[PDB]
Amino acid sequence: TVIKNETGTISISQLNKNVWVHTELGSFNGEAVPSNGLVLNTSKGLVLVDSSWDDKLTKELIEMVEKKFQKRVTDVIITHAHADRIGGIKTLKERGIKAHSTALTAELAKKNGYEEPLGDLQTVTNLKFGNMKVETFYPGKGHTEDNIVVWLPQYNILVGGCLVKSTSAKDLGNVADAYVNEWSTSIENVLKRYRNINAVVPGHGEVGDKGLLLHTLDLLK
Ligand SMILES: C[C@H](CS)C(=O)N1CCC[C@H]1C(=O)O
Ligand SMILES: [Zn+2]
Ligand SMILES: [Zn+2]
């Protein structure tokens, strides 16, 4: 099941009964650039993994999911301090939506002029929202110094975020903020921690499996 807004700039795609991928198009130099996160439909509200490029898109994403699922967005996990992830932080804060992050992500957000998420996540943090279990894991530096992954142990779904490249990505993209001698080790740390993975959601591009991790390793050669 895929559901879209009018222009198609926001889309939600169902992985299972309570887990959807959200995808938004940002516009840069005339080019549409998609970005993915997660929508978790829990008994106590909606939880997102990541916001979107800006506040306009974040507001519309929130409004779409609250209407559809008939409950409020209560929490967002921000997986690094780039605009695709954190661009909607003003909206989250003013609506009273909790914005979780590592301390480092919050430190980088502040340095770069964004409002700050909570800085509450550790190297491993286990959260529960209603019956939905969520683990966050900092595997080390890669796409950025601060990138984290999110694991849903009830589904063995990994949100790789922008640490993990989709099959369609043929290069590493912008590496200004990346750690290209460490990114492989960080990917290996993910593979070590999660030895049995169903889906892997990359930050940009199509959902895949463990193969996306191996693809990212190959791109780093
Ligand atoms: C703006 C995002 C932040 S993760 C980005 O760097 N992307 C998005 C797609 C690839 C890569 C790039 O521009 O090189
Ligand atoms: Zn990024
Ligand atoms: Zn990204």
What is the domain count for the chain?
A: 1
Q: Residue 164 Cα, ligand 3 centroid: separation in angstroms?
A: 9
Q: Residue 129 Cα, ligand 2 centroid: separation in angstroms?
A: 26
Whose structure tokens read 């795609």?
Answer: 13
Q: In what order do the strands lie in the sheet with 149-152?
A: 124-129, 132-137, 149-152, 157-161, 200-202
Rounded Cα distance, 114 and 112, in Å:
6
Method for this entry: X-ray
Q: Is 100 annotated as a binding residue?
A: no
Q: Is 22 annotated as a binding residue?
A: no
Q: What tokens were used for 185?
A: 């080790």
The one-letter code for the residue type at 99 is A
| CATH number of the domain to which 42 belongs | 3.60.15.10
Q: What tokens were used for 149?
A: 């992954």
Inter-CA distances, 129 with 21, 76, 77, 113, 211, Å: 18, 11, 12, 30, 29
Which atom of ligand 1 is found nearest the CA of 143?
Answer: 4
Give the residue numbers spanning the domain of 185: 1-221
Query: Ligand 1 pocket, 29 CB below 6 A?
Result: no
